[PDB]
């Protein structure tokens, strides 16, 4: 179910903590049913590096710690 | 049927997952230990069988090199169950 | 008397248990509750890191995956 | 029936059937205390009168975004050693010391931007806030690209706390510091998403 | 299959050793008395065998989760 | 403008009213 909600989030731009801790800011093109997430307009911030621009990135559901959602995001609405 | 799912909800109001539905029903805060080795203090807006969660008003709390407390705030969050280790109902927090 | 994992576990409810996690911490408490996926809820929970009583947590949900083994206590 | 099973699949089928007879969820009623988790406080509200208006905060945040655009024009066109706490303090604050010219900050990489920010917070803890300092903090923040690491979030919250604390010492809104403090707090609290520190009036 | 291996060990009620996935400093040993399709084991008379330090901690009857298991062998 | 930050700061402090 809660993954229904994630799939309602195209064009929302978010930040993702990966499991290795890398922070991944981008805009959602798609989320699938096993939480794999495709992004575009991506900025990756790495512990001991400078950052990284990328036109697109696609990311393994099971490589995600959590999503940081945009604050304006209207939750009660999408929880249905 | 599909109304055998209403066992699920009876099963959340009593299972171990009650701990979560607490927070949802009552707008209470919980404290999750997370595998990133940090703690998340927040309210649960929603959750599933797997402990996937939508949280509000989260403080990420942790420590680091004599070790200094650190934190960071997060308005809204989708937390993967995978990242969750344990979850406190009625945690005790202080300045 | 082959004892199987579900019935064994259902059998631990009510009683003192020592859950030990994949990552080396363990938790003692009274096994309040249990579901299909073998999630668990403990009361009067106590944390032990390196075996040292770390904290007194009260009521606590443990997600199934993190569990290494569970066993009863006196 | 009342034999035993000779193959694994049969045994399992036998387990499965037993596991459907069992209750799926079981709760045990018990009959009758808790460590503390030390949590960093927020931002010290503003004395009555001093809290800036929503329309002002919104105003600067927008302005600060713009400022960061320009910080990437100069950034294409390209100092103490990165680890030198002391030199960096000198370099920036001096006795005087150097302003934050695009010349110099656009040459600083992200890990440095961040370290320096730490060094100027560490100065600020035990020294008073100047407008020289205000400039550097404002600069280094504008030179922080995001998404930020968490270490760097915690950093700027520390700094936003430290501001709100100093703001309590002020005795007339005519203090030079007030606006600079209100700003930095507003920026951390609204531009960098830590609204749990923000001055809602 | 790994299950067929176990199954037998249950017939003999053999004493077995378990190699854990996440943990290398440690083995689990016990006599097997039940299991299920996810290879969770009920294990009796059970022990934590610390490597190097040659020590052994009595646990008694435990249930070992199946996701944890690298490898099974007899003792 | 090399001091464009310095300026933008002061402009921003100044602008409190």
Both tokens of residue D72?
């990437």
Residues C4, D19: C-beta atoms closer than 8 Å: yes
Distance of CA B59 to the CA centre of its chain: 11
Where do the domains of chain C lie, and which CATH numbers do they carry?
1-74 (2.30.30.100)
Residues C3, E42: C-beta atoms closer than 8 Å: yes
Structure determined by: X-ray
What range defines the domain where residue E34 resides? 1-75
Both tokens of residue B55?
């949280």
Identify which of B15, B57, B72 has the shortest CB distance to residue D150. Answer: B72
Separation in Å, CA of F7 to nearest CA in chain D: 9
Instruction: Please report the residues numbered 33 through 52 in chain D whose beta carbons come closer than 8 angstroms to any beta carbon of chain E.
Output: none
Q: What angle do CA D168, D65, A45 make, to 5 degrees?
A: 95
Both tokens of residue A46?
């790495």
The CATH number linked to B79 is: 2.30.30.100
- C-alpha to C-alpha distance for C67 and C26, rounded to whole angstroms: 9
Number of domains chain E contains: 1
The answer to whether C19 and D16 have CB atoms below 8 angstroms apart is no
Q: What are phi and psi of E31, to 5 degrees?
A: -100, 130
Q: Could you tell me which chain C residue has the CA closest to the CA of D22? A: C7
Nearest to residue E61, comparing CAs of E33, E36, E35, E27?
A: E33
The CATH number linked to E39 is: 2.30.30.100
Residues A24, D147: C-beta atoms closer than 8 Å: yes
What range defines the domain where residue B50 resides? 1-95
- C-alpha to C-alpha distance for E41 and B79, rounded to whole angstroms: 30
Count of CB pairs separated by less than 8 Å, A with B: 55
* Distant-in-sequence, close-in-space partners of A34: CB < 8 Å, separation ≥ 6: A3, A61, A62
The bridge status of strand E69-74 relative to strand E41-50 is unpaired
Mutate one of F12, F14, F15 to test the D interface: name it (highest D CB count within 10 A).
Answer: F12
Separation in Å, CA of C46 to nearest CA in chain D: 9
Judging contacts by C-beta atoms under 8 Å, the chain F residues touching residue D64 are: 12
- Interface present between A and B (3 or more CB pairs within 8 Å): yes
Residues C7, D34: C-beta atoms closer than 8 Å: no
- C-alpha to C-alpha distance for C34 and C42, rounded to whole angstroms: 9
Asked whether the bond before D147 is cis by omega within 30 degrees of 0, the reply is: yes
Measured from the Cβ of residue E66, the count of other Cβ atoms closer than 10 Å reads: 17
- Cβ of residue A7 closer than 8 Å to a chain B Cβ: no
Left (φ > 0), alpha (ψ -120 to 50) or beta: where does F6 sit? Answer: alpha
Would you identify the CATH topology of the domain A1-80?
Answer: SH3 type barrels. (2.30.30)
What resolution (Å)? Answer: 3.4
């Amino acid at each position: 179910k809660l993954v229904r909600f994630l799939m309602k989030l195209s064009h929302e731009t978010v930040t993702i903590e990966l499991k290795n801790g890398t922070q991944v800011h981008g805009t959602i093109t798609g989320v699938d049913v096993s939480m794999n997430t495709h992004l575009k307009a991506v900025k990756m911030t790495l512990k001991n590096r400078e950052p990284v621009q990328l036109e697109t990135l696609s990311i393994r559901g099971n490589n995600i710690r959590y999503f940081i959602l945009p604050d304006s995001l209207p939750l009660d609405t999408l929880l249905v | 049927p599909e109304e055998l799912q209403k066992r699920e909800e009876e099963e959340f109001n009593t299972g171990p997952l009650s701990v979560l539905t607490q927070s949802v029903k009552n707008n209470t805060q919980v404290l999750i230990n997370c595998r990133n080795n940090k703690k998340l203090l927040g309210r649960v807006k929603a959750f599933d069988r797997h402990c996937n969660m939508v949280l509000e008003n989260v403080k990420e709390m942790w420590t680091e090199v004599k070790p200094v407390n650190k934190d960071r705030y997060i308005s809204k969050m989708f937390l993967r169950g995978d990242s969750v280790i344990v979850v406190l109902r009625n945690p005790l927090i202080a300045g | 008397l082959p004892l199987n994992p579900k019935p064994f576990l259902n059998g631990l409810t009510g009683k003192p248990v020592m859950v030990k996690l994949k990552w080396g911490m363990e938790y003692k408490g009274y096994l309040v509750s249990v579901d299909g996926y073998m999630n668990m809820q403990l009361a009067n929970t106590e944390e032990y890191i390196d075996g040292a009583l770390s904290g007194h947590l009260g009521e606590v949900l443990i997600r199934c995956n993190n569990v290494l083994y569970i066993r009863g206590v006196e | 029936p009342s034999v035993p099973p000779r193959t694994p699949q049969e045994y399992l089928r036998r387990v499965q059937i037993e596991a459907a007879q069992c209750p799926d969820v079981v709760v045990a009623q018990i009959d009758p205390k808790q460590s503390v988790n030390i949590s960093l406080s927020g931002c010290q509200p503003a004395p009555e009168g001093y809290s800036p208006t929503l329309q002002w905060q919104q105003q600067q945040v927008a302005q600060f975004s713009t400022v960061r655009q320009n910080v990437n024009k100069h950034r294409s066109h390209w100092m103490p050693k990165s680890e030198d706490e002391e030199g960096w303090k000198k370099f920036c604050l001096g006795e005087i010391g150097f302003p934050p010219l695009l010349s110099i900050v656009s040459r600083m990489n992200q890990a440095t931007v961040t370290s320096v920010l730490e060094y100027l917070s560490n100065w600020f803890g035990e020294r008073d806030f100047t407008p020289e300092l205000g400039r550097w903090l404002y600069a280094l923040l504008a030179c922080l690209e995001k998404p930020l690491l968490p270490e760097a979030h915690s950093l700027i919250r520390q700094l936003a706390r430290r501001c709100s604390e100093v703001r309590l010492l002020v005795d007339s809104k005519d203090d030079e510091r007030v606006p600079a403090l209100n700003l930095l707090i507003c920026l951390v609290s609204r531009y960098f998403d830590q609204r749990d520190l923000a001055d809602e009036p | 299959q790994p299950i067929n291996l176990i199954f037998r060990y249950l017939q003999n009620r053999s004493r077995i050793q378990v190699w854990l996935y996440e943990q290398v400093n440690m083995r689990i040993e016990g006599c097997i008395i039940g299991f299920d399709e996810y290879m969770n084991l009920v294990l009796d008379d059970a022990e934590e065998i610390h490597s190097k330090t040659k020590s052994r901690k009595q646990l008694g009857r435990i249930m070992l989760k199946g996701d944890n298991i690298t490898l099974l062998q007899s003792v | 403008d090399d001091t464009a930050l310095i300026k933008a700061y002061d402009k921003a402090v100044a602008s409190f009213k």
